[PDB]
Every structure is written in structure tokens, then in C-alpha cells.
From a paper:
[name] ([name]) is a protein that is essential for many DNA metabolic processes including DNA replication, base excision repair, nucleotide excision repair, mismatch repair, and recombination. [name] is a ring-shaped homo-trimer that acts as a sliding clamp that encircles DNA forming a scaffold for binding numerous proteins involved in DNA metabolism. [name] is required for translesion synthesis (TLS), which is a pathway for bypassing DNA damage during replication. The subunit interface of [name] is comprised of two anti-parallel β strands: strand I1 (residues 109 to 117) in domain 1 of one subunit and strand D2 (residues 175 to 183) in domain 2 of the adjacent subunit.
To better understand the role of the subunit interface in translesion synthesis and in other DNA metabolic processes, we used random mutagenesis to generate a series of [name] mutant proteins with substitutions in either of these two β strands. Twelve of these strains (A112G, Y114F, S115E, S115G, S115V, S177G, S177L, S177V, G178L, G178M, S178T, and [name]) had slower growth rates than the wild type strain of approximately 4 to 5 hours. Six of these strains (Y114A, Y114F, S115E, G178L, [name], and I181R) had the same increased level of UV sensitivity as the K164R control strain. We then examined the rates of spontaneous mutagenesis and the rates of UV-induced mutagenesis of these 17 strains as well as E113G and G178S. The E113G, Y114A, and G178M strains had an approximately two-fold increase in the rate of spontaneous mutagenesis, while the S115E and [name] strains had an approximately 4-fold increase. By contrast, all 17 strains, except the S177G, S179A, and [name] mutant strains, had statistically significant defects in the rate of UV-induced mutagenesis (with p values less than 0.05).
Author numbering:
A (entry chain A), B (entry chain A), C (entry chain A): 0 to 254
């Protein structure tokens, strides 16, 4: 009992985990003094999940020692289905820990639920694959992006994002036919968060697997907007902005 | 780009397809100058689905050429799950078409989704099996008819509709037991659409498969009332009245 | 047509059956002059379900003859999915019956649905295993008890209820980790039905199967509170208080 990180609402940490729990299985939660960060590469080694949770995301955070505690998402999510969404979730562990302790407590002092989670042993191959300059950079409503991905997934397992100047084009092409959703950058004032931005330095023609994109758009529940950075050189970066933190999805193109 | 039929709301065409998509698989959409009509016989050749969609059902309809464009329901329904229920769905095709183009556009000009559907090749065995005079003719609330069919389906796979004068009797008889729902014709004034009519010229004792009836009652979402015409000679006619059009289910009795 | 028991709402009898239909399969409904009682032991012979339905639970009850009519829950529940929740459900049978008749009728006289259920032949091994004195006796909100059982079921198939003085402790221990929910007896005044009582005569350390507890907590829909009596000698008694009646779950501990 030494780091005891504490969330205001247990739902918040649950929503964060639920955002990327489907695309991966094992995760290396590397928590330190300035907060918690984590990475997780899937089995096929084509999708990286990078997470950062700052101090301000907690209502009371402490960590007198850099502790790397990896664990299974399926096991972690099971314990996360025990709270009452508004309970006080406290992540407790000690120096060189065997298990992480999750403490659920409501506003009243009737319910005091304490859970233990046997920690996994994960290799420390941390990746830094974010580029300085991307060929194209765009940001759109997360709910809108989920719509495009889900609709095109009906047609084929290959969604081709094609970006030219002032033209963002999503195209799917399968056996039963094809589909094409085309959006253009604009500005709104009644609700400026529905706006679409585009900063193209060079035209982009990349192809991504539909299987992976469907898991990526599940982070729409964490942010209203999604930042997409496309490059012909490095994997694409799908970023969801959290309150004092972020959830990144690095996806490698096909072909 | 020559016929371009256009719906006010994309939901309407989706609801129509959803009304009969389960009981069949391939459909021959025979659209012409006065609107669109279609037929579909299942594999077992005991259930016919006849559809008619008049000009008034569209908000803007054109067709300078009688075009028969058949297609797969499963593939068609997939594309129909892309709209936003209130988008402008436009069915576009050309003379001697390879594929039918479905264009989704909302009120604003942000979303312009265009889909292509590879057309099937369906045989032109169109059937006209509607009789002049049926032994019995009745009409009841569609939601009420769905209740009777669903409840009796629990007991056995054979639902026997038995009609005598002023007595409409639905009977199921299986291994675990039996059930009998009996309704009588009457008139209401607070909401005359809940009334039950019956025009019996001759008593009817027909037996239908529960499997088929369950698919037939799925058209209750298209009309408040359902018209049933029973004959000992020809297949029974279950008819749902659309706004400027209809959805018919011709079902052959057992034994 | 001789006993014709009658419920005010068909939903009530449906909810009662739905309370214990999952943990067993065959049930011996032994109805008599003062009401209806029934017992059902599962295949593994470790869980007994005892039911009592008094006269006051019906809106109109009669029974001129003690009749034991056993039946299959699955078949009984099927027929129970036919009503409209507010219909007049009437259980009809005769002296030495072959089948039990279930009559559904609404407030209006349009719907008159009559169902027959072929009665099963069940052995008359009725059990009286309730003790006089139990080591511990407690009562808590049924919704709260369901929460504890469901959450701990995620961890292992063995939930250990551990009771000491003024301390009720639920513990699960599995491969991925463990969990512990600890509640203490108190009194509320805004809503005294959320209170927790405990009358310990002797400390209790019993282990129950999670499979069975999950079925037991399904009776939370019948009562706000659940009475639990634990004994080291006899099976534990989980009791849900009905309006003029009860639903009991006798569960044998492990090890």
C-alpha cells in the first residue's frame, strides 16, 4: 500500500479500458510520478495502443516509485464490472508487487469491496513510432468517424482512406459492391466541435484492415473528436484526446 | 443515371425491405413508369412475396425505361444500414445496368455517401395467383395478429386458422399441449382502426406452417391493419396496405 | 372445471415462475384448499425450491379437492409468454386431470385465449429440511445481494460466505485473483427496507457454488429483501417474502 491511485468515479477507468480492451489482450501499465502510461501490441503486430493518464485525471494520485504492473485485459475488465459507476475506485499496489488491489467504495460506508488481480509478466518492448511530420493531418467528430467505418465494413475487409486537397475520401470495395463516403473541411459556430479540419502536405492513398478500424473507433466514447494522422512511411495515428491524457491507435497500412 | 428514384426518408425503403427480407433471399425489382413492383418466391416454393411501390411513395420519382433489376436481400439490407433514417436515399441505375447506385445525402451538405450494389440475375417467372373470390375475407389490427401467431408458435409448427360465421379461430396443437385464440368481428369508434371485419361466403379450415406465418407478421411495422383472404382452392393472401402501394404474402396451406 | 384458480394479473404468476424456472426443470404444484404450494429438486440434488402461494395472492381462488398437478417449467413458461401482463389468467383443471387449462382474458371481451398444458408425472418425494435454529440469520436488500453474487461470480465458481459478530463477509477466490465484499448491520429511517439485520448465535464459514447462487438471486424481482439463514449442519435457506406466500431456496454447502 504505497501508490494507491484513486479515481473520482469508477466508470471513468472502466470507459478507458473499454476503449481499447477489444483490439488487444495484454497491457503493460507503466505508472510513475507524473501519472500512468501504457502500451499494448496485438498478436499480429500491426496495431499499437498507447495510453496516457495524467495526475489531473485522478481525484487523488500518488506514486513514490516507478512501478510497471502488466495485466490481462479480460481479467481486468471482469473486476471493473463490479463497481456502481460512481464508487471510489482505488488502484493499490506495493513495491515489487504480486497483485494489484482494486478498492471499490461508495459515498456511504456500507459497501467496501476489495478485489485482487494477479499481475502478468509482460516484456518491456516499448515502442516510440510517432513521426514528426505526417503527410496529412485531419480531425473530425468521433461519432461521425465511427459511422463511416461501420458502414463501409459491411462491404469489404479493406477500407481505403484517400486524401487529396480539401477532399477526404473513405472507400470500401468488396464482392457485393462498393461504397464511398466523402467529407470536406468546414467550420461551424453553433457547435464548433462538429467541424472538420485538414492539413495536407502531400496526397495520401493508404489501405487499412476493417477488422482493426472497427476496434479503433470504439474510443469514440472517450472523446467527441478524433485526430487522424496519415503517412505513407509510418503507421497511421488515430488519437482520442482525454482530459489530461490521450488514447492512441497506431495502425499499419496494408499492401 | 436515368431513373434515379428518390425517397423522402431512407428509413421508409429500409422498413419496406425489412418487412419481407427474412422469408426470401432473392428479389426481382421490376421498376417502370408508374412506380416499382417486385416478386420473390422462397426456395421451398410455398410462399410468394408481392410488392408494389407507387409514385406517391417517393418524393421525386422518374423512370424513362422499364428496367428489371434483381438483387440479393442480404446485400441490399447491408447497404440500407448505412443511412441516418432521415437522409435522402436515391436509387440510381442506367439502361441495361450492371449495378444499382444508392446515394445517401442528409439535409446539410457534409455527408454524401454513394454505394454500388452488384445486381443479380433472376429468372422472370412472375406469378399472378390472386383469386377473384375468396371463401373468407377478414381484417384485424396487425399488432394483434402478430401476437396470436407468436403465442401459438410456442406450441407447435402448425397453426390452424378455422373460420365459421362470426367466429375467427386460431388453433395450435403440439406435444406439450395446445392453444386457441378466438376473436369476433366488432366496431369501435374511439379508434375504428382496431375493428375486426369478417366477410365469410363459405366456412374455412386451413392449416399453415408456423415458420412462414412468423415471417409474414413482420410486415406489421408497415401497416396498422392486415388483410387476410382465405380460400380452400388457392394459397392464402396476407396483405399489408402501404401508402400508395402494398406488401402481399401468398402462403400455401399444409396437408 | 372445478378448481379454477384466478390471478388478478397474468404477470404475477409469470414473475413467480420466472423466479425459480432456471435452477430446476420439473415442478410438483400441490394445490389445495388454503392455496398452492410446490417443490422442485434439481438433478444434482443440492438445491431445493419451495414455493407457497396463499389465497390472498389470487383475486379469486377455489379448490374443492387437493390436486397435485406436476408440469415442466419450460412448457409452462412458454404458455406464460402469451398474456398481456394485465390479462385475467385462470388456472383450470378437474379431478384426476390430464392437462391444466390456462385461460387468458383481458378487460375487454375481444381476446379469449385458452391454452392446454399436458401434465407431467412427478414423484412425491416432498422434503421438509428447514431447521428450527440456524447458526446465523440475516436479511439484506435483494438487489444488493444480487450485486455481490454477480460480481464475485466473475472470479471463481466458489463463493464463501463468512459470518462473524457484526461482520458479514462474502469472499470469492479464483485463478485471476480474488474479491471480498464486506457489509455491516445498520438501521435506516428514510427507507428502512434498505437496512441490514444480523442475528448470529455462532460464527459461520460456509462455501457455496456460484452456479447455484446465480439462480437463487433471480428471485430478487419478487421481493425487495432476502432472508438468509446459514447453518453448518443443514443446507442454507434463502427466502424471498411474497405477498401472502414465499419463495424458498435451500442450498447445500460445498466441501
Amino acid at each position: 500500500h504505497m501508490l494507491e491511485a484513486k479515481f473520482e468515479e469508477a466508470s471513468l477507468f472502466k470507459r478507458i479500458i473499454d476503449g481499447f480492451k477489444d483490439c488487444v489482450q495484454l497491457v503493460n501499465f507503466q505508472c510513475k510520478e507524473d501519472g500512468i502510461i501504457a502500451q499494448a501490441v496485438d498478436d499480429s503486430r500491426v496495431l499499437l495502443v498507447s495510453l496516457e493518464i495524467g495526475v489531473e485525471a485522478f481525484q487523488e494520485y500518488r506514486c513514490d516509485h516507478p512501478v510497471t504492473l502488466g495485466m490481462d485485459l479480460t481479467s481486468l475488465s471482469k473486476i471493473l464490472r463490479c463497481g456502481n459507476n460512481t464508487d471510489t475506485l482505488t488502484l493499490i499496489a506495493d513495491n515489487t508487487p504480486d497483485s494489484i488491489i482494486l478498492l471499490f467504495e461508495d459515498t456511504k460506508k456500507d459497501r467496501i469491496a476489495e478485489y485482487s488481480l494477479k499481475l502478468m509478466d509482460i516484456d518491456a518492448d516499448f515502442l516510440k513510432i510517432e513521426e514528426l511530420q505526417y503527410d496529412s493531418t485531419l480531425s473530425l467528430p468521433s461519432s461521425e468517424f465511427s459511422k463511416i467505418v461501420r458502414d463501409l465494413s459491411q462491404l469489404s475487409d479493406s477500407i481505403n482512406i484517400m486524401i487529396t486537397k480539401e477532399t477526404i475520401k473513405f472507400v470500401a470495395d468488396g464482392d457485393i459492391g462498393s461504397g464511398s463516403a466523402i467529407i470536406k473541411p468546414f467550420v461551424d459556430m453553433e457547435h464548433p466541435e462538429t467541424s472538420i479540419k485538414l492539413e495536407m502536405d502531400q496526397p495520401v492513398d493508404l489501405t487499412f484492415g476493417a477488422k482493426y478500424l472497427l476496434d479503433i473507433i470504439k474510443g469514440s466514447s472517450l472523446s467527441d473528436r478524433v485526430g487522424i494522422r496519415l503517412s505513407s512511411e509510418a503507421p497511421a495515428l488515430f488519437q482520442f484526446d482525454l482530459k489530461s491524457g490521450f488514447l492512441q491507435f497506431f495502425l499499419a497500412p496494408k499492401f
